[PDB]
DNA sequence: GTCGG
DNA sequence: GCTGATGCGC
DNA sequence: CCGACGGCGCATCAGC
């Protein structure tokens, strides 16, 4: 891609600041700063020209002129060979294992994939999920598993109950070619807003799920958010399909809107939308949005009857979803 | 790390 | 138990 | 130690 040099080395900054520096918003500049060159439709050929972009400063635009001259950051360089660096960005990958485990259990000389092995009584239940499908879980699923994916889910859905509605949200509602795990926001007429009038709603679908053995394994489950693993069944002779990584939410059905605009993300777009709104005078959930007042506190929830609407209100043109991609 | 009150 | 902080995650 | 930065669900822990 154009600037994808540049757009990986803010990445990888921006994984390390998250990982090992626990530093967040360092976090967040990086993946700001590289959603912003990642738009830009010119080759940048200086830090001073990437400086005039929002989210762009002195420093970044210093480590732009360094990888330009060099096609390569003496920083990045410097982290790769640190193992302790590179052993800690690595734990984080299992589902489970965050910054702060990870440290502590490099800091306990627990650095390797055969090292959670012989250590399982170290992890909790999730971290155990995590590590048994480690190598699923960095796998991509191609659009045509996603589509039986979910053919299951939506006739597992209307089997429970007709009037629900699961619409497959996430980089699949976005048109990706590839996803790295599926989404599913669910909505029945029973939740809403005013009054949740049946109990279980989200669990009557998930026990449905597991019962056809979709759902395989439950990493966390509340009243409306689900967080698991699931499979496509294969046929005789043939390898497994992958384990993989399945969310499900369940949104009031008067808010599905803002649920939906949350949940086709990206992520990046959607911090980049809820900053915008503040700067016009607004805040946006998934469940509304709401105009500040004076205290910096929210008022009433807006009317909104479109994915459009919500745009409307802090002046932004209409993006499909598959323009909310990076 | 960047931006703005 | 609670509230609030922290850690996991979307 | 300038302080906000997008916003929140679920799980766990500290200090009641
Ligand atoms: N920090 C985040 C992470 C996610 N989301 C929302 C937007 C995402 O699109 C959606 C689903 O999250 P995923 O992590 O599944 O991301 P995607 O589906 O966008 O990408 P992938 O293809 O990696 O699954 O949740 C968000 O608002 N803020
Ligand atoms: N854009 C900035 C820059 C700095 N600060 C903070 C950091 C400083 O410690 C504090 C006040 O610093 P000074 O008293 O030095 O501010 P002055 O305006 O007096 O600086 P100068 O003497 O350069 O005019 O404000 C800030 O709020 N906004
Ligand atoms: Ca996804
Ligand atoms: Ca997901
Ligand atoms: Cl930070
Ligand atoms: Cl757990
Ligand atoms: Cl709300
Ligand atoms: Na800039
Ligand atoms: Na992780
Ligand atoms: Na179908
Ligand atoms: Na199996
Ligand atoms: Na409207
Ligand atoms: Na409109
Ligand atoms: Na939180």
Same mark, same amino acid.
């Given at each position: 891609?154009?600037? =994808? %040099? $540049?757009?990986?080395?803010?990445?990888?900054?921006?994984?390390?600041?998250?990982?090992?520096?626990?530093?967040?918003?360092?976090?967040?500049?990086? &993946?700001?700063?590289?959603?912003?060159?990642?738009?830009?439709?010119?080759?940048?050929?200086?830090?001073?020209?990437?400086?005039?972009? @929002?989210?762009?400063?002195?420093?970044?635009?210093?480590?732009?002129?360094?990888?330009?001259?060099?096609?390569?950051? !003496?920083?990045?360089?410097?982290? !790769?060979?640190?193992?302790?660096?590179?052993?800690?960005?690595?734990?984080?990958?299992?589902?489970?294992?965050?910054?702060?485990?990870?440290?502590?259990?490099?800091?306990?000389? $627990?650095?390797?994939?055969?090292?959670?092995?012989?250590?399982?009584?170290?992890?909790?239940?999730?971290? &155990?999920? =995590?590590?048994?499908?480690?190598?699923?879980?960095?796998?991509?699923?191609?659009?045509?598993?996603?589509?039986?994916?979910?053919?299951?889910?939506?006739?597992?859905?209307?089997?429970?109950?007709?009037?629900? $509605?699961?619409?497959?949200? %996430?980089?699949?509602? !976005? =048109?990706?070619?590839?996803?790295?795990?599926?989404?599913?926001?669910?909505?029945? @007429?029973?939740?809403?807003?005013?009054?949740?009038?049946?109990?279980?709603?989200?669990?009557?679908?998930?026990?449905?799920?597991?019962?056809?053995?979709?759902?395989?394994?439950?990493?966390?489950? /509340?009243?409306?958010?689900?967080?698991?693993?699931?499979?496509?069944?294969?046929?005789?002779?043939?390898?497994?399909?992958?384990?993989? &990584?399945?969310?499900?939410?369940? $949104? @009031?059905?008067?808010?599905?809107?803002?649920?939906?605009?949350?949940?086709?993300?990206?992520?990046?777009?959607?911090?980049?939308?809820?900053?915008?709104?503040?700067?016009?005078?607004?805040?946006?959930?998934?469940?509304?949005?709401?105009?500040? %007042?004076?205290?910096?506190?929210? /008022?009433?929830?807006?009317?909104?009857?479109?994915?459009?609407?919500?745009?409307?209100?802090?002046?932004?043109?209409?993006?499909? @979803?598959?323009?909310?991609?990076?």
């Amino acid at each position: 891609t154009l600037n =994808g %040099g $540049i757009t990986d080395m803010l990445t990888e900054l921006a994984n390390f600041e998250k990982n090992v520096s626990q530093a967040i918003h360092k976090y967040n500049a990086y &993946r700001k700063a590289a959603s912003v060159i990642a738009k830009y439709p010119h080759k940048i050929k200086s830090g001073a020209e990437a400086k005039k972009l @929002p989210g762009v400063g002195t420093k970044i635009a210093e480590k732009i002129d360094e990888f330009l001259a060099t096609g390569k950051l !003496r920083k990045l360089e410097k982290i !790769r060979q640190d193992d302790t660096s590179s052993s800690i960005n690595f734990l984080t990958r299992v589902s489970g294992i965050g910054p702060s485990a990870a440290r502590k259990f490099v800091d306990e000389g $627990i650095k390797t994939l055969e090292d959670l092995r012989k250590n399982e009584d170290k992890l909790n239940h999730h971290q &155990r999920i =995590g590590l048994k499908y480690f190598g699923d879980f960095e796998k991509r699923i191609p659009r045509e598993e996603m589509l039986q994916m979910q053919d299951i889910v939506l006739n597992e859905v209307k089997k429970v109950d007709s009037e629900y $509605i699961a619409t497959v949200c %996430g980089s699949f509602r !976005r =048109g990706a070619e590839s996803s790295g795990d599926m989404d599913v926001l669910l909505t029945h @007429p029973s939740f809403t807003s005013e009054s949740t009038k049946q109990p279980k709603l989200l669990h009557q679908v998930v026990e449905q799920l597991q019962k056809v053995h979709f759902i395989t394994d439950t990493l966390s489950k /509340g009243e409306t958010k689900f967080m698991g693993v699931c499979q496509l069944p294969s046929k005789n002779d043939e390898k497994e399909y992958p384990h993989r &990584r399945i969310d499900i939410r369940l $949104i @009031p059905k008067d808010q599905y809107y803002c649920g939906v605009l949350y949940f086709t993300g990206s992520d990046i777009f959607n911090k980049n939308m809820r900053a915008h709104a503040l700067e016009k005078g607004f805040t946006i959930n998934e469940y509304t949005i709401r105009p500040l %007042g004076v205290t910096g506190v929210a /008022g009433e929830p807006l009317p909104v009857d479109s994915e459009k609407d919500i745009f409307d209100y802090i002046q932004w043109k209409y993006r499909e @979803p598959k323009d909310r991609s990076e």
